[PDB]
Design a protein around this nucleic acid. Structure first.
Lengths: 147, 689, 14, 124, 310, 49
RNA sequence: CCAAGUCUCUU
RNA sequence: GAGACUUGG
């Protein structure tokens, strides 16, 4: 657009290199799903390879999102699986499954809106939250290494 | 020479000017300002006796704050032969039946009460403007924006124009906020909101006569050497407070009603947790500003408050949270007293050492304040000292009061001269430090001031306005001055001869406070000259401008009964009605509001709602309106909310939930509506359900 | 096991 | 006796019933609420010094063991209670069950050390 | 009683109790119309499952299988719950249920129990419809878990009440918290009243009303009710619990004396001076108000006398 | 409204202060609500909405 | 999002 | 106890 004047060129350049545009152009490229952006604390927030959540509660958690919202870690703490469960059963016992789901319902007796119970536990389901600036910065970092 | 103080010459001129025309009186506050109200009431005293049914009339005194209304009613009763009525929410005036209102106006010729009570009373058609001969508004400068004074004023633009009463405004200051520039426009909007033109004294003889009861206190600025270095205990306390905040973030108390911003844009920390955060933040600010001894007083204030809250706790979780807050407060107090005792090694005479620590363990502002007091009232008669202190925050009053108590019972020269006292506005804090369930003390602080029991008063913007007090020898504005009107009224409070006025300002802000004080000087002189020199034969605003001053808001709605639903009152009426649906001590739930987002706004409002704000009200499940009523596209969130409430209340009235007067249907009237239709056989026995 | 058919109910249905 | 009996022995009884189940204990400690924080300052001396030795000691295996040994030295049986919290790490609450009512909480990784540093700040 | 429903309903047309109507002759009073906006019959079961997971668990615990699940959600929707914008609260449904259940249970005891006097019969009607017994029944079947409510206080009362009930093994009893003489030993014998929340009974009753509106078969509804309340039916047919205070005053050897309620803060208690086996035991009741404190004292006394006589 | 076939008036004057006088007279003599538009109120910058 | 003051209604 | 208003940050 060599014809354009300087001011419009500056404005458009600002928009192109602005954080929002970079965020979107990197999101559609599907890189952010592979970012290292959380401090490694294996004991608390991490999922060992051969170890996973119960499949029954897992499928409930992924399938039913509204149920997911209010799930609190104590509910997970309440799921003190017996050795048979965690070793060979995969899904938890129906009684444990129940008691846990009623516990999750009782969580509604706490804050639906203000308290995001999932944040402290999102790593269990594999969801992560990242500031936009970080996403943009990763895009520039990739460009810079390529250069 | 008469027990009923004769009208003074300027009072005579003001009365005979007002009796012919409605206008606003502008004079420095005093007994004369109230007396002119009394006399204008007297001069319109022809049609009180005869009943309203016979075309009788009454008088309407407009006060702002309930205590001001009380004091004004007392003064009227003691200065007049009429009998007056007082009307606030305390008197259970809401339930007063029409018979009570009738026989009341029969007994009380003059009706006195707060703004909103009378506003609702007129809007409920209990009485009509034609039924009122005159209306007197005091502190009328408060009448701006959506203030109930302004709503009551707008009401006149709805009823018939030939039975409109006399409107009189009393005030010692005309501007409200910091908009001191371009005075003429503001004065015109005030005079046009009301239906008159300002009046005052101009003649030099009138000037001299005014000066006898009004005095201009001598004022001197005082500044302290601002120091910034902070002690280790401060950072420690910050650290434990931060740790408590992070812990409390996840306390996970039981579900409470959703709390969201005043603009309905963002969620909020619940009132239970928010209150704790506010209290500790205030304590931190107090410690930062005034130092360590002030912090020691403030932490006991917190202890008392939180123990009271714990005793008012109902939840095991909230009980635990409040006990924990108490425990942290106690830790902080222990650490502070340790620091106090960590320096007592300097000397063991705790009496003078209290003074010395308050010099060392408190900020230069405090030190300057205390030694200024010491040099101000060294060895004077306690009866001869009557001075005020102005501070900003509520808890600052309590803190400084305790600090002054310790100082008085620490210094030999002031131990038997000063009697510190304090008082703050609504949400009265505990005036006691020992958390005992009940105390013998009953006399109110203001009554102590009037009777002379208390001579030193620490008030925060309460005693400034309206509250009648004897002329004070001194007035110390400890906190920085912020508002023109506040400055002027504080200055006027120091009314006595030779009264001294004092400002405490930080050195770095010295020149800015100078700028502000002289902008205020210029505004005051401008007002004076503009009143003196201006002349107008009409002495009232015209109809076109009066009509143009108000239409900006949404037009009001009225029914055939004439009941008016002001859009500004729509939210109040909504919450009023919704307070009656629940039938449980714990099932009580208020309406939940919601703001539509761009895409939802699109697929509902088409392309008609672009560049405007829209709010949707979704009333709870119980009542019948669940169509998700939508506000018309308004400019801002405030007007959008007002429109939402207006539309919702209109719909409810259309659904009959409002008893043709825009109040919720009480069970008695609600059942009477069905009586005739399901109880026909009753009427034949001289008996009705 | 088997509920007694409530006489009011068995009557209003038969 | 009228005021000694009628109002009075009932003043104690009513407050007593509050502390039993209703209230979180009450300030029946004699000193001024202003000086209530000094409760542990005036705590029973020789045992105070013994607890000082215990706290300053470095032979204790764990902060849990340190807290328990110190606190029994104080001759107080606390109750460790889990407060329901959003934190992944469980949140624990403790009671000092003494006239000077005191309650603390933190994450289990922190609770014990927080007891330690509290009593360091208080018992001094 | 003589003429049955579909006939004696017209008695009201005769007596104008409910005004005669050609559109709705009184004979047709079983045609309830839950009109208005409070109900919607169009929401897919997916939304309710999002609000009601583990449906099958609830179905089998209740003992009846539902067909249109929306009735459930509207019944379990406690008014404080904001995020259910498809249906109203349960109040209008518990309003009809309460009557429905009173009628059904009364009809059963009438048909089956002809050997028990009418006075205690009305007392038993009052006790069975009493929210206390209904709440005990509800908790016994663990229905409280699914109730969709959004207020702390009711949840907390529910929690403590279910705890106490479980400590009592789901047995109706004088709802007293024996704070001191397992109770420990102390100077005197005092206790407080376990408070029964009413929302629990309300939700159970609204659930039964939902059953009625869904099935429209009243025999099946009675099957459900009998299955739910059979233990209490068998029990109360052997003992009739009248009002506790009236139970004491009629009981020969109670002679309780209630002192003036002394006020401190919001708390008030009553000193209950009574006697048991010729020795005077001083028991005290507590409550928010005077009547509640007196009832607490009386319930504690009946508790003590039950242990003494058994 | 215009979109509904409505129409408006146009009191065009020569000088800004004369326009002021005429608008003020119109306001006092008519029940219509009139809008005053000169370059000082920033008439240029008003948007379509 | 925070401070001050005021008012209404209600325990 | 609940809401609101004004002013200011």
């Amino acid at each position: 657009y060599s014809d354009w004047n300087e001011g419009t060129l500056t404005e458009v350049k600002s928009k192109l290199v602005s954080n929002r545009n970079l965020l979107f152009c990197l999101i559609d490229a599907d890189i952010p799903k592979t970012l290292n952006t959380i401090q490694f604390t294996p004991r608390y927030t991490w999922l060992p390879p051969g170890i996973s959540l119960p499949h029954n509660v897992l499928a409930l958690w992924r399938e039913n999102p509204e149920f997911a919202k209010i799930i609190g870690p104590h509910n997970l703490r309440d799921l003190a699986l017996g050795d048979e469960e965690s070793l060979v059963k995969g899904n938890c016992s129906d009684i444990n499954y129940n008691r846990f789901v009623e516990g999750c319902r009782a969580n509604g007796q706490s804050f639906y809106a203000g308290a995001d119970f999932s944040s402290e536990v999102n790593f269990c389901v594999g969801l992560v939250t990242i500031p936009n600036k970080v996403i943009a910065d990763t895009l520039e970092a990739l460009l810079g290494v390529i250069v | 020479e008469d027990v009923e103080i004769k009208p003074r010459g300027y009072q005579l001129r003001l009365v005979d000017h007002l009796t012919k025309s409605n206008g606003i009186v502008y004079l420095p506050t005093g007994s004369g300002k109230t007396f002119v109200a009394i006399l204008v009431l007297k001069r319109f005293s022809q049609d009180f006796d005869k009943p309203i049914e016979s075309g009788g009339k009454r008088a309407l005194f407009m006060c702002n704050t309930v205590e001001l209304a009380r004091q004004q009613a007392m003064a009227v009763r003691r200065c007049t032969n009429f009998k007056v009525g007082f009307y606030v929410g305390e008197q259970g005036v809401d339930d007063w039946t029409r018979g009570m209102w009738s026989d009341e106006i029969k007994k009380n010729q003059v009706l006195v009460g707060t703004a909103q009570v009378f506003l609702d009373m007129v809007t409920q058609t209990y009485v009509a403007l034609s039924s009122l001969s005159v209306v007197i508004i005091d502190e009328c400068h408060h009448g701006t924006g959506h203030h109930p004074f302004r709503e009551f004023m707008r009401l006149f633009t709805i009823a018939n124009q030939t039975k409109l009463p006399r409107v009189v405004g009393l005030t010692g200051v005309l501007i409200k906020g910091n908009e001191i520039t371009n005075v003429a426009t503001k004065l015109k909007e005030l005079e046009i909101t009301y239906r008159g033109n300002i009046i005052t004294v101009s003649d030099t003889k009138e000037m001299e006569n005014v000066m006898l009861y009004a005095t201009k206190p001598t004022e001197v600025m005082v500044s302290f050497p601002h120091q910034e270095q902070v002690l280790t205990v401060t950072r420690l306390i910050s650290a434990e407070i931060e740790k408590f905040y992070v812990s409390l973030d996840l306390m996970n108390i039981g579900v409470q009603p959703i709390r969201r911003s005043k603009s309905l844009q963002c969620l909020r920390d619940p009132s239970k947790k928010s209150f704790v955060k506010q209290l500790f933040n205030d304590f931190l600010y107090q410690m930062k500003e005034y130092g360590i001894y002030a912090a020691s007083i403030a932490i006991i204030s917190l202890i008392v408050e939180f123990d009271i809250k714990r005793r008012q706790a109902e939840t095991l979780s909230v009980k635990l949270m409040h006990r924990t807050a108490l425990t942290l407060c106690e830790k902080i107090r222990h650490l502070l007293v340790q620091k106090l005792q960590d320096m007592t090694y300097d000397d063991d005479d705790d009496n003078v050492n209290t003074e010395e620590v308050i010099m060392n363990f408190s900020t230069p502002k405090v030190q300057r304040f205390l030694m200024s007091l010491k040099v101000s009232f060294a060895d004077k008669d306690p009866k001869d000292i009557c001075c005020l202190v102005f501070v900003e925050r509520r808890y600052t009053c309590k803190c400084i009061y305790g600090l002054l108590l310790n100082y008085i019972q620490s210094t030999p020269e002031l131990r038997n001269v000063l009697t510190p006292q304090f008082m703050v506005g609504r949400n009265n804090i505990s005036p006691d430090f020992e958390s005992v369930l009940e105390r013998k003390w009953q006399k109110s602080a203001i009554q102590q001031f009037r009777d002379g029991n208390a001579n030193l008063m620490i008030c925060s913007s309460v005693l400034e306005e309206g509250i009648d007090v004897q002329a004070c020898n001194h007035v110390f504005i400890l906190d920085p001055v912020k508002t023109f009107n506040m400055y002027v009224q504080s200055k006027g409070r120091a009314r006595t001869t030779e009264a001294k006025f004092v400002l405490f300002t930080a050195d770095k802000e010295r020149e800015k406070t100078i700028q502000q004080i002289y902008q205020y000087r210029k505004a005051h002189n401008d007002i004076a000259e503009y009143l003196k020199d201006r002349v107008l034969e009409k002495t009232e605003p015209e109809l076109y401008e009066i009509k143009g001053h108000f239409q900006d808001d949404i037009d009001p709605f009225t029914n055939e009964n004439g009941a008016v639903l002001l859009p500004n009152n729509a939210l109040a009426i909504l919450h009023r009605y919704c307070q009656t649906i629940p039938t449980d001590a714990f099932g009580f739930v208020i309406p939940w509001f919601h703001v539509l987002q761009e895409d939802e706004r699109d697929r509902i409002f088409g392309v008609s709602a672009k560049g405007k704000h829209v709010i949707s009200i979704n009333m709870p499940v119980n009542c019948m309106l669940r169509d998700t009523i939508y506000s018309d596209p308004m400019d801002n969130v405030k007007t959008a909310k007002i429109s939402a409430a207006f539309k919702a209340c209109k719909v409810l009235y259309s659904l009959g939930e409002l008893n043709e007067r825009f109040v919720p249907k009480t069970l008695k009237e609600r059942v009477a509506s069905i009586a005739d239709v399901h109880f026909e056989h009753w009427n034949k026995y001289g008996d009705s359900v | 096991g088997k509920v007694k058919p409530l006489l009011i109910l068995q009557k209003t249905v038969s | 006796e009228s005021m000694e009996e009628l109002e009075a022995l009932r003043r104690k009884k009513f407050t007593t019933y509050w502390e039993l189940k209703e209230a979180g204990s009450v300030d029946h400690t004699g000193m001024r609420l202003c000086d209530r924080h000094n409760y542990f300052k005036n705590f029973y001396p020789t045992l105070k010094k013994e607890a000082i030795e215990a706290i300053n000691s470095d032979e204790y295996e764990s902060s849990k063991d340190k807290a328990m040994d110190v606190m029994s030295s104080l001759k107080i049986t606390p109750k460790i209670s889990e407060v329901e919290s959003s934190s992944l790490v469980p949140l624990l609450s403790v009671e000092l069950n003494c006239a000077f009512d005191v309650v603390l909480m933190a994450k289990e990784t922190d609770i014990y050390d927080h007891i330690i540093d509290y009593f360091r700040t208080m018992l001094i | 009683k003589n003429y049955g429903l579909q006939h004696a309903f017209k008695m009201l047309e005769y007596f104008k109790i409910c005004r005669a109507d050609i559109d709705k002759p009184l004979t047709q009073l079983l045609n309830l119309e839950l009109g208005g906006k409070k109900m919607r019959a169009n929401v897919n079961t997916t939304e309710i499952d999002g609000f009601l997971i583990n449906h099958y668990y609830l179905e089998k615990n209740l003992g009846y299988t539902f067909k249109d699940r929306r009735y459930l959600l509207q019944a379990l929707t406690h008014p404080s719950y904001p995020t259910n914008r498809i249906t109203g609260s349960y109040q209008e449904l518990e309003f009809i249920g309460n009557a429905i259940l009173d009628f059904l249970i009364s009809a059963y005891i009438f048909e089956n129990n002809t050997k028990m006097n009418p006075g205690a019969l009305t007392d038993l009607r009052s006790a069975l419809v009493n929210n206390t017994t209904l709440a005990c029944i509800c908790v016994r079947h663990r229905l409280h878990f699914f109730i969709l409510a959004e207020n702390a206080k009711l949840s907390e009362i529910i929690s403590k009440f279910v705890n106490f009930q479980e400590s009592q093994g789901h047995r109706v009893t004088n709802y007293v918290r024996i704070l001191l003489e397992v109770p420990p030993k102390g100077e005197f014998n005092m206790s407080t009243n376990v408070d029964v929340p009413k929302a629990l009974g309300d939700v159970l009753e609204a659930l039964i009303a939902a059953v009625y509106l869904d099935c429209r078969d009243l025999q099946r509804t009675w099957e459900v009710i009998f299955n739910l309340f059979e233990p209490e039916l068998q029990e109360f047919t052997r003992k009739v619990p009248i009002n506790h205070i009236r139970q004491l005053v009629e009981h020969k050897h109670a002679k309780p004396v209630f002192s003036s309620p002394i006020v401190e803060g919001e708390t008030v208690m009553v000193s209950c001076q009574f006697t048991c086996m010729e020795k005077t035991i001083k028991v005290y009741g507590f409550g928010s108000n005077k009547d509640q404190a007196k009832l607490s004292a009386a319930k504690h006394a009946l508790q003590q006398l039950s242990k003494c006589d058994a």
